Design a protein around this ligand. Structure first.
Ligand SMILES: [Cl-]
Ligand SMILES: [Cl-]
Lengths: 267, 266
């Protein structure tokens, strides 16, 4: 597909016309993870799908200062270049979901809806309430290609079978291969927004939907559940046998629920 | 096909062979509400599907005393007769999901799994945390048949369209026509289990999945979110634009999640 680059040096794909969806991928991943996942699903066709590479990931340059504040500013700049003041839908995974929240919180009137998978809500890892990873070993797998990533797959994915390994290689490996680890490490020294507590308390005035796994040792599920009651339009799906690579563990659930979420907005 | 009756005077359907699924319906409904919904939306094929009419509802006789404790007792008798000691899966809607919880608590070693839609957790209506009901008026409906039932459809369902009205007529009205209002009215005076608090604190040691709706004014969602708090195998689906007739508002979602649940257990 055709890769574009904003003047703010954010690499992205843009496909389709109609209401924009801005997809923000997880930490160490890239737009392959989002693009390859959502393009196959029946009802994103009517939308303009915009898959960004975060700074220091994919084909997007690292940025100085290497802080979450600068990431947010750069992504806001980027979105304006791409769609201007047109109203948009947000999708976010992991740190992508943290930034999705920050954007929704700052561009309240321009945001139509937010859908998050395994989102970061507390940036500081030492503060997070996390779950316990496990494996459900469904099938024997004999890896040929990408053998060197197999442990990370096993350490991250919950449901272990051939399709999950194929998905990991297709969606996760590309980002791992491009991530700027030094940039990420520096970012993590200035990772938490000063308004993080506001994100934890805000009652968004549009659909706000979260999918979390019981076995997600990176961001867990508790803190996300706590966002739900006070969010008037807050939805949650929390599932067993599901971890941080929730979109592989529960491929079909994410497709189903993303579609159901678009239905909400369509109404 | 065939309708069955236990020695305990519980009316039921039982379809297929295999691991048993015991389906419990909501208050005032009957086993048409469960049977007609799940049999078509089915990855239920490899299971034995058992759809019970609760006492005083459907074609199951009322009981004395008319208390939830005794409703539970009757149901335990019924299950033991129908499946003995076989391990089983539980489905419960609303009052049926309250009973389901009780059953799983009582038959903890036999219960493989519990799937609940809009479950009663606190029986006492005056103590429940509930949502605000709304309608999403998608189409005009000009009812011809069952016009006298239309108010309660509007009052309960959230998503209002013609399909929702057809489903309501096929799923909810048969139970309405059969319910023993006198039993139910009496049952509602001894509605809490004597052990009710123990249900609110159990950490079930098998998958325990709940679907709830933001706009459910009957049982809400908050108490159910809190159960997921202390359940290590707790799952929850909480959706907007959804009320107490969740199987009608979110028909696809229920079949999807119930299939997923079965897979979880398999
Ligand atoms: Cl490339
Ligand atoms: Cl009485």
């Amino acid at each position: 597909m055709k890769e574009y680059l904003t003047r703010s040096n954010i690499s992205y794909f843009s496909i389709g016309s109609g209401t924009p969806i801005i997809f923000l991928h997880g930490l160490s991943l890239d737009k392959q993870s989002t693009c390859l996942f959502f393009e196959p699903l029946s009802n994103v066709g009517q939308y303009q799908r915009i898959y960004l590479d975060l700074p220091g990931m994919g084909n997007s340059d690292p940025i100085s200062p290497s802080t979450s504040d600068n990431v947010l500013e750069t992504l806001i700049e980027a979105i304006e270049e791409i769609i201007g003041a047109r109203r948009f839908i947000l999708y976010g995974h992991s740190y992508g979901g943290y930034l999705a929240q920050a954007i929704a919180f700052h561009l309240k009137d321009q945001t139509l809806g937010v859908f998050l998978t395994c989102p970061v809500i507390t940036a500081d890892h030492s503060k997070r309430l996390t779950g316990k990873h496990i494996n459900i070993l469904e099938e024997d797998i004999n890896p040929v290609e990408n053998k060197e990533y197999f442990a990370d797959f096993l350490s991250m994915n919950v449901i272990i079978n051939n399709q999950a390994w194929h998905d990991y290689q297709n969606l996760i490996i590309p980002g791992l291969q491009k991530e700027d680890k030094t940039f990420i490490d520096q970012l993590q020294n200035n990772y938490s927004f000063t308004f993080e507590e506001k994100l934890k308390n805000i009652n968004y005035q549009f659909p706000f939907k979260i999918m979390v796994g019981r076995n997600d040792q990176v961001v867990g599920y508790q803190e996300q559940l706590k966002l739900i009651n006070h969010n008037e339009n807050g939805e949650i799906v929390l599932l067993n046998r599901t971890g941080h690579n929730l979109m592989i563990d529960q491929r079909e659930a994410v497709g189903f629920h993303f579609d159901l979420f678009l239905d909400e907005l369509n109404s």
